[PDB]
Design an enzyme around this catalytic site. Structure first.
Site, PDB file in Angstrom:
ATOM      1  N   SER A 194       0.586  -1.354   0.044  1.00 36.73           N
ATOM      2  CA  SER A 194      -0.132   0.083   0.045  1.00 36.73           C
ATOM      3  C   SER A 194       0.945   1.360  -0.029  1.00 36.73           C
ATOM      4  O   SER A 194       0.305   2.336  -0.056  1.00 36.73           O
ATOM      5  CB  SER A 194      -0.978   0.159   1.228  1.00 36.73           C
ATOM      6  OG  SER A 194      -2.319  -0.587   0.829  1.00 36.73           O
ATOM      7  N   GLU A 216      -4.760  -7.630  -5.229  1.00 33.05           N
ATOM      8  CA  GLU A 216      -3.847  -8.601  -6.012  1.00 33.05           C
ATOM      9  C   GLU A 216      -2.133  -7.947  -6.127  1.00 33.05           C
ATOM     10  O   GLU A 216      -1.466  -9.145  -6.168  1.00 33.05           O
ATOM     11  CB  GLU A 216      -4.016  -8.954  -7.365  1.00 33.05           C
ATOM     12  CG  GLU A 216      -4.613  -7.974  -8.293  1.00 33.05           C
ATOM     13  CD  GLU A 216      -5.971  -7.639  -8.633  1.00 33.05           C
ATOM     14  OE1 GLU A 216      -6.668  -7.661  -7.517  1.00 33.05           O
ATOM     15  OE2 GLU A 216      -6.466  -7.896  -9.909  1.00 33.05           O
ATOM     16  N   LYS A 245       2.841   6.483   5.213  1.00 32.77           N
ATOM     17  CA  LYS A 245       1.778   5.585   4.500  1.00 32.77           C
ATOM     18  C   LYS A 245       2.551   4.369   4.876  1.00 32.77           C
ATOM     19  O   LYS A 245       3.622   3.963   4.433  1.00 32.77           O
ATOM     20  CB  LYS A 245       1.753   6.103   2.946  1.00 32.77           C
ATOM     21  CG  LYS A 245       0.868   5.238   2.321  1.00 32.77           C
ATOM     22  CD  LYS A 245      -0.723   5.247   2.669  1.00 32.77           C
ATOM     23  CE  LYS A 245      -1.516   4.193   2.508  1.00 32.77           C
ATOM     24  NZ  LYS A 245      -1.478   3.093   3.693  1.00 32.77           N
ATOM     25  N   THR A 246       1.589   3.504   5.199  1.00 33.30           N
ATOM     26  CA  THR A 246       1.634   2.162   5.563  1.00 33.30           C
ATOM     27  C   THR A 246       1.393   1.119   4.496  1.00 33.30           C
ATOM     28  O   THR A 246       0.520   1.460   3.570  1.00 33.30           O
ATOM     29  CB  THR A 246       1.231   1.550   6.947  1.00 33.30           C
ATOM     30  OG1 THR A 246      -0.255   1.863   6.777  1.00 33.30           O
ATOM     31  CG2 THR A 246       1.504   2.287   8.234  1.00 33.30           C
ATOM     32  N   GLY A 247       1.904  -0.205   4.531  1.00 36.18           N
ATOM     33  CA  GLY A 247       1.568  -1.301   3.587  1.00 36.18           C
ATOM     34  C   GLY A 247       1.656  -2.748   4.393  1.00 36.18           C
ATOM     35  O   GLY A 247       2.449  -2.706   5.118  1.00 36.18           O
TER      36      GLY A 247
END
EC number: 3.5.2.6
Length: 256
Positions: free
Chosen positions: A39, A135, A201-203
């Site tokens: 992300s 995905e 911003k994380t992911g």
């Protein structure tokens, strides 16, 4: 050694790159090692959208259907009958990590292939956008699609938010959104001293991948740009946020 210690403690692989814009002092550990960006790509996507439109164009209302909704649509699912403006979509994407929001934006810029061209344009020949969400989260070791490096992510984040890839007012929009993120309290934000402002911003992806990219402002001084990527050796492995927080503390000490 401090970084090695963390990999031991958490049974994970760590990818770090930090740059002090004030002194050009650097902190690196597996800086050029590839990891699924997850992300974190959402921030780069907005950067491109911002470059492509005027502040006013952001007011354009986008209509969508239930068909545009994916796995995680916190904001997006509640406005299917009314539609959402580009500005609102960007908010949802960055602050809540709304997946449908990301897809909607991507469509507006021409898709993953278009995004790739734009990153190349800014001088980023590493980042590899190829799929929509979620995905894009499905990356196996060795694969290069939807991957990047710690060095590349900070270089690109810095370009859009602090340098000349965007004019001042647009830069401001991006930074504000990132500063008011609701998903990173336990990460980079937790390893930073009291008083320092953070835009992040994380992911999270497969193989227990857990990332956080940010810009940190000391009370007084020039900001620090940092990327903290991590992954584990099992497909269904879980992650521990504490890894990020602790790695952050090491960076600060190494720079302080």
């Amino acid at each position: 050694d401090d970084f090695a210690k963390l990999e031991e403690q958490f049974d994970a692989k760590l990818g770090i790159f930090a740059l002090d814009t004030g002194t050009n002092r650097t902190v690196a550990y597996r800086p050029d090692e590839r990891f699924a960006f997850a992300s974190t790509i959402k921030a780069l996507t907005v950067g491109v959208l911002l470059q492509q439109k005027s502040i006013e164009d952001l007011n354009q209302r986008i209509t969508y259907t239930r068909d545009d909704l994916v796995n995680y649509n916190p904001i997006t699912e509640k406005h299917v009958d009314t539609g959402m403006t580009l500005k609102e979509l960007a908010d949802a994407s960055l602050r809540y990590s709304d997946n449908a929001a990301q897809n909607l934006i991507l469509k507006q810029i021409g898709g993953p292939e278009s995004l790739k061209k734009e990153l190349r344009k800014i001088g980023d020949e590493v980042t590899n956008p190829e799929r929509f969400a979620p995905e894009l989260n499905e990356v196996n070791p060795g694969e290069t699609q939807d991957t990047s490096t710690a060095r590349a992510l900070v270089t690109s984040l810095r370009a859009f938010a602090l340098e000349d890839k965007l004019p001042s007012e647009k830069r401001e929009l991006l930074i504000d959104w990132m500063k008011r993120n609701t998903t990173g309290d336990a990460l980079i934000r937790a390893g930073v001293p009291d008083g320092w402002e953070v835009a992040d911003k994380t992911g999270a992806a497969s193989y227990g991948t857990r990332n956080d990219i940010a810009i940190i402002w000391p009370p007084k001084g020039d900001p620090v740009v940092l990327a903290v990527l991590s992954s584990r050796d099992k497909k269904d492995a879980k992650y521990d946020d504490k890894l990020i927080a602790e790695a952050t503390k090491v960076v600060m000490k190494a720079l302080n």
